[PDB]
From a paper:
[name] prevents uncontrolled retrotransposition of [name] subfamilies using distinct mechanisms: canonical [name] is inhibited by a self-encoded restriction factor, p22/p18, whereas [name]’ is inhibited by an endogenized restriction factor, [name]. The minimal inhibitory fragment of both restriction factors (p18m and Drt2m) is a conserved C-terminal capsid domain. These observations suggest a lattice-poisoning model of restriction by p18m in which the [name] binds full-length Gag and forms dead-end intermediates in VLP assembly.
Therefore, we included [name] in [name]’ CA-[name] constructs and in Drt2m [name]/[name] (SS) for crystallographic analyses and [name]/Y326S/[name] (SSS) for biophysical analyses. The asymmetric unit of wildtype and [name]’ CA-[name] ([name]) crystals both contain two monomers arranged through a single Dimer-1 interface and the Drt2m(SS) crystals contain four Drt2m(SS) monomers arranged as two dimer-pairs through Dimer-1 interfaces. Inspection of the location of these divergent residues reveals that in p18m and Drt2m the three divergent residues lie at the center of the hydrophobic Dimer-1 interface. Concurrent with the increased spacing in the VTF interface of Drt2m and [name]’ CA-[name], the side chain of the conserved residue R315 can adopt a rotamer that allows it to swing in and hydrogen bond with T270 which is not possible with V270 in p18m. Thus, this “arginine-flip” mechanism provides a further level of discrimination and specificity between AVL and VTF Dimer-1 interfaces. Therefore, p18m([name]) and Drt2m(SSS) form dimers in solution with sub-micromolar KD with some tendency for further p18m([name]) self-association at higher concentration but that in Drt2m(SSS) is largely suppressed by the introduction of the triple serine mutation.
Author numbering:
A (entry chain B): 262 to 350
B (entry chain A): 261 to 350
The structure:
């Protein structure tokens, strides 16, 4: 009953600093976006990008410098950058 | 401006009302958030909007959360009337 509200809240309160696997973070955010699109709440690529960048902490905060191109960025590309920084760790 | 949708969704997720501000301004802020989100392509159902507004109710207005069983059964307008009733009584 609250699946949409909890998913939107978790999308709004994303937080990543590299202490957990970047692949798991990517997959769980993708599940949030997928359940929200199936429940009637479409999240554009720019909006999902903005949320994920607001959630990046630590070295990943560096990625926020590209936040001007959140429209030009892709959720997949941002997730790949996160995976690269995580592989460097 | 570019992040307007994210800011509106964040404000909708962290609503907070306890009666210290006018209920008209609170209703207006919730309605503006919902309207901008629907105009930008993010439709918030009546049940979802009710759940969001009720999660924010504090103080005596916490009593209103007891009607949370009727989220689909209740419109945003009815919740706003309840909030206005408690505020006018205060």
């Amino acid at each position: 009953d609250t699946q949409e509200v909890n998913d939107i809240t978790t999308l709004a309160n994303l937080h990543y600093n590299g202490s957990t696997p970047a692949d798991a973070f990517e997959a769980e955010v993708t599940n949030i976006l997928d359940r929200l699109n199936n429940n009637g709440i479409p999240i554009n690529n720019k909006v999902a990008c903005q949320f994920i960048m607001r959630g990046l902490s630590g070295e990943y905060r560096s990625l926020r410098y590209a936040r001007s191109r959140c429209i030009n960025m892709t959720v997949a590309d941002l997730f790949l950058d996160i995976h690269a920084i995580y592989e460097e760790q």
